[PDB]
Amino acid sequence: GSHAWDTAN
Amino acid sequence: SDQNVDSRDPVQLNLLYVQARDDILNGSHPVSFDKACEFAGYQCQIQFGPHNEQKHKPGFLELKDFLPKEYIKQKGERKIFMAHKNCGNMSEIEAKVRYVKLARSLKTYGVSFFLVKEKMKGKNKLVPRLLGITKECVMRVDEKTKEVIQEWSLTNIKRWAASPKSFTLDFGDYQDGYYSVQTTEGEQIAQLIAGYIDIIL
């Protein structure tokens, strides 16, 4: 939640 | 994401981290109040994970486990949480690395210090002072701020003397008047100086 981010890059 | 894989040995890192952390926490490695809270911020990141405003508030920590003794009676908890906040989502390994590098970057790092007592000016009560000894100099450090106030090249030392309650330095031509302090570690200090001076030629 706004912290444990995820990215494709 | 990804790509940069961490191949650092976490076991070795933890060992370096623990030694650095313990020396700061027990006073062996004297640091300022600001630095102690910065270290404490990384410690929090390491033991608790990213700062959570909901839980990580004053009263959440046992300050004796995060700060040198002399800084516990101050408003350090507040400063500690701001430093904790700065770490953002930093990983535990990254935090340990930052902690060790910050400790190693300090001028006081790896320096042998002795807490002695100096009698001075218009003061009847002795004043605590950190006396540091390196392979290049003897330094007088403020016991509170941990800032270097005076430094003497080892090449300027003529002779020294130790008693069960003191240590004295004689700088010969350098200055008229010896430097004498109260300490129970006089011979330990003499031995270190002695060894360092033997090599200075």
DSSP A1-9: --SS---SS
State which residue of chain A sits closest to B50, comparing Cα positions.
A3
Q: Is B50 on the interface with A (CB under 8 A)?
A: yes
A7·B89 Cβ contact <8 A = no
Closest chain B residue to the Cα of A7, Cα to Cα: B1
- End-to-end CA distance of chain B, in Å? 56
Pair type for strands B112-118 and B148-153: unpaired
Q: How far apart are the first and last CA of chain A?
A: 19
Which domains, and CATH codes, for chain B?
10-107 (1.20.80.10), 109-201 (2.30.29.30)
Chain-centroid distance of CA B119 in Å reads 23
Closest to B97 measured CA to CA, from B46, B51, B63, B33: B46
User: Among B167, B170, B151, B160, which residue's Cα sits nearest to residue B198?
Assistant: B160
CB contact under 8 A, A8 and B50: no
How was this entry determined? X-ray
Name the residue type at position B81. F
- CA B120 – CA B127 distance, rounded (Å): 8
Chain B nearest C-alpha distance from A5 (Å) = 10
Tell me the residue type at B53: E
Query: Which value in Å is the resolution of this experimental model?
Result: 1.9
Q: Residues B133, B197: contact at Cβ < 8 Å?
A: no
The minimum CA-CA distance between B1 and chain A, rounded to whole Å, is: 4
